[PDB]
Design a protein around this ligand. Sequence first.
Ligand code: HEM
Ligand SMILES: C[C@@H](c1ncncc1F)[C@](O)(Cn1cncn1)c1ccc(F)cc1F
Length: 449
Amino acid sequence: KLPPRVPNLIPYVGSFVSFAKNPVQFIIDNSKKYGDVFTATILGKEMTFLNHPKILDTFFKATDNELSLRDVYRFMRPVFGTGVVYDADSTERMMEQVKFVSSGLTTARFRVFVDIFEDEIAHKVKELGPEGTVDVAELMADLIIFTASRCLLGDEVRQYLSEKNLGKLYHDIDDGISPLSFFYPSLPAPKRDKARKAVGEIFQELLDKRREEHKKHPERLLDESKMDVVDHLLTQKYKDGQELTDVHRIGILIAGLFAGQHTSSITSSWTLMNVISNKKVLEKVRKEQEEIMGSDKVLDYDKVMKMDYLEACMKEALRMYPPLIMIMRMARKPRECEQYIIPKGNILVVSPSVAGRCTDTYTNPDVFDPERLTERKEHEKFKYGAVPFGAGRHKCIGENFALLQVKSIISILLRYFDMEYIGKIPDPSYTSLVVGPSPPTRMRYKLRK
Ligand code: HEM
Ligand SMILES: C[C@@H](c1ncncc1F)[C@](O)(Cn1cncn1)c1ccc(F)cc1F
């Protein structure tokens, strides 16, 4: 059989409307009507949703000529650049470029990354003063924007953030995209395209500076903890021998910073909100924090490794608010799920959000409650029963830096501040590509020494 279709409102538009209102309720809704697998027509596209953790093996283990990423995230191309990652000329090449990123995400570096978080948050505290209120979301994204850039690019980048408005340009790029672009890649976005060029020149300036610093200081290349992604990109070839071009290099740096920022900082936000808005949770985080700092006055990587509870909380926030609510592949060959045959051409879909709220796995799924993971080990039920970082051939290569980043930021913040949130925890806003908390998200903070 072909799977149970979802009745269209209109031909073509199909089921767009109730989907776009709320994509996640839409999938769940119709799960209950038509069970684990169903098809909906959404703006001229056949889209098949795979909803129960059981049947998601064939999805995550398929190959790039069975189930294709490149065919579905290619629209990211005005942002990332041409022939780069998902618009890169082959499966094999895409993977090679990904690795250049991940190759600046090593232990030696992660230790240097924690100084960076300290450093960046020290500056932020002056700019904030002994008390006030502030937006968590703006706050997370401001920090990460600085921490990620220094982490992946090097310290050289700072001055272009401080003296040359580099943050704004990111937004002008990162606002010039949309969940709609999926259906209409060619939609014009002239403010974005002018920024992506503006950022280009700057990254080209950055590579150009870096090339001579490898002349003036060649020892840099032996020290494994001053080797950032620019460095790896300047001294690797592809496996087949061929050099990279700067415009590939630039589109990778950019692809990594995008990855590097939006999912992280939404996750911080969701997390801190739930932590400080629940006294029992916040005791244990502070109990854990205090034991682990002991006599020590600032953070290090060992310490952050040890933060098991704060980590369960981050995870618990990812179960409830994964920022990538839909994972997608295009079928290049017909595919068999359950008793059905999902046709070639279709776009298969899996949703960490729906899974985060599937009641076989998780009990009272609407309650932030890190104990469900640490103690009732609920996530361990099914093998794909918890998927905020994907799984299989394309599982997130950023997972450990993410965790390092969110835990360092929250832990350092709680050192400095008593903080409390201001009203109900918001709902998720389905307006962006990386989903996040509806604004505003306000909190009172007061210093502590
Ligand atoms: C902080 C929360 C994060 C979440 C929830 C997240 C989530 C994901 C997910 C679900 C995927 C799978 C995509 C798919 O299968 O279609 C993925 C892939 C990826 N993520 Fe992340 N990510 C996070 C942070 C990061 C960071 C910090 C980096 C890099 C700095 C990163 C880089 C990537 C890359 C390069 C891939 C592509 C993997 C591949 O093509 O094989 N992510 N991420
Ligand atoms: C394709 C993109 C994405 N995928 C799915 N739904 C919405 C999206 F925006 C994403 O997977 C997000 N991502 C994953 N980890 C961090 N960010 C991604 C991957 C690689 C990359 F180099 C940049 C990048 F955005």
